[PDB]
Structure 1
């Protein structure tokens, strides 16, 4: 298993599991799950109402010092009743490490903003509202940053189609760029690429 297989590190896995136990024991009010992946990456899953009292801990404790906010992401999983999965990625420079803090929300449930902790989120979660529809409480300046000004609907939801609902064209009748219902010259060919055999035995879910 030497040349074509990725090497496995166990000291980093043990240290990340120890830090996960440390975090889950320091904060038992909001932390739900702690899991270390196979490629040595820690994940903390907490309650949404504990987004803010956890993160500042990871920004201010001497044993964590996760001073950088790398990426902030929401993931749409329509199976769960809380279809939006907010993901904070934190980087600690003094200890040279990376952590992931995950939480959940639905459409109508507000989430407490993180601009009081990391100022970069002042843009990041704002883009989330532009793409998914997750409302963030006490945001300083919340407005759409990527989509069009008159755009209705959140495009990154999985129920939103690939092509939109309106397409633009110039009109000499009104001398204006107008929006019309979408009519494609060629349909987007949907491909069925999933092999019908069992993919991995180690990731086998139990049946009903």
Structure 2
């Protein structure tokens, strides 16, 4: 083996000993207080400009969320697409979350990106098993397949959509798997039938039944209530005594 002859063994070099390592303790939420006031300000401006649809807004750390009426979908996303201070020209993601304890089961979550302002915004609305939501493929061509997924996986129906068909599931599939009443292994299974010369569909049997270890969740709450971190600019002034 012909060694490079001016490339020495990097392992043969001795390293300077590291003694006592010290790291400060940081609270990562603390880095987000400097932008907490404007994120609240922007959400406050948004719901004054569209009082007809924006029910509330929340702020967690760097995330501002806007809560809207389902019928306000087209106006709100138009304002967030074509406003000069709201130049949010990407849909990053549209998905649903299921809350069977609500009268409107489905929360529709939109995540939007503004390359102009290096900013993100989340828009939430609600839907039901029968209550449809406006499609926004009139504003974002990229939102088309996302709504097919929400429909395919949840059953939510998007008025105005061209070609709202299943995107993920099999062709004659019945059910919406991301619903919380839908079982994990489904209701049907497939196999090849020698006597019928095709693949047939059967009721589900499992050689091993799925073992659900949810019951081992701590009898004690482990996170607690948290900490309130609202700007003083969005708290009500307190009445001074006397």
The two structures have a TM-score, normalised by structure 1, of: 0.93
Work out whether 1:19 is the aligned partner of 2:46.
no
Separation in structure 2 between the aligned mates of residue 129 and residue 2 of structure 1, nearest angstrom: 48
Q: Distance in 1 between matches of 2:222 and 2:130?
A: 36
State the Cα distance separating 1:193 from its structure 2 match.
2.6
Mapped to 2, the partners of 1:183 and 1:4 lie a distance apart of 52
Aligned mate of 1:168, from 157, 169, 190: 190
Residues 1:43 and 2:65 are matched in the alignment: yes
The 2-side partners of 1:194 and 1:2 are apart by: 33
Does residue 1:134 correspond to 2:156, yes or no? Answer: yes
Give a deviation string over 1:125-180, Cα, whole Å, max 9, x none.
11111000001101111111100001011111000000011101011101100111
Q: What's the CA shift string for 1:33-83, capped at 9, x where partnerless?
A: 11101x220000010000110001000000110111101011001000101
| Contiguous gaps of at least 5 residues in structure 2 | 1-22, 228-242
How large is the RMSD of aligned CA atoms in angstroms? 1.5
Name the CA distance, whole Å, in 1 between partners of 2:200 and 2:142.
36
Q: Which residue of 119, 132, 140 corresponds with 1:110?
A: 132
Who is 1:93 aligned against?
115
User: What is the TM-score of this pair, normalised by structure 2?
Assistant: 0.81
SS of alignment partner, residue 65 of structure 1: coil
Are 2:165 and 1:152 equivalent residues in the alignment? no
Q: Which residue of 2 aligns with 1:189?
A: 211
Q: Which residue of 2 is the match for residue 59 of structure 1?
A: 81
Gaps of 5+ in 1: none
Select between 194-203 and 145-154 the one with higher mean Cα deviation: 194-203
Cα 1:2–1:83 change in 2 (3 A) is farther
Number of residues paired by the alignment? 203
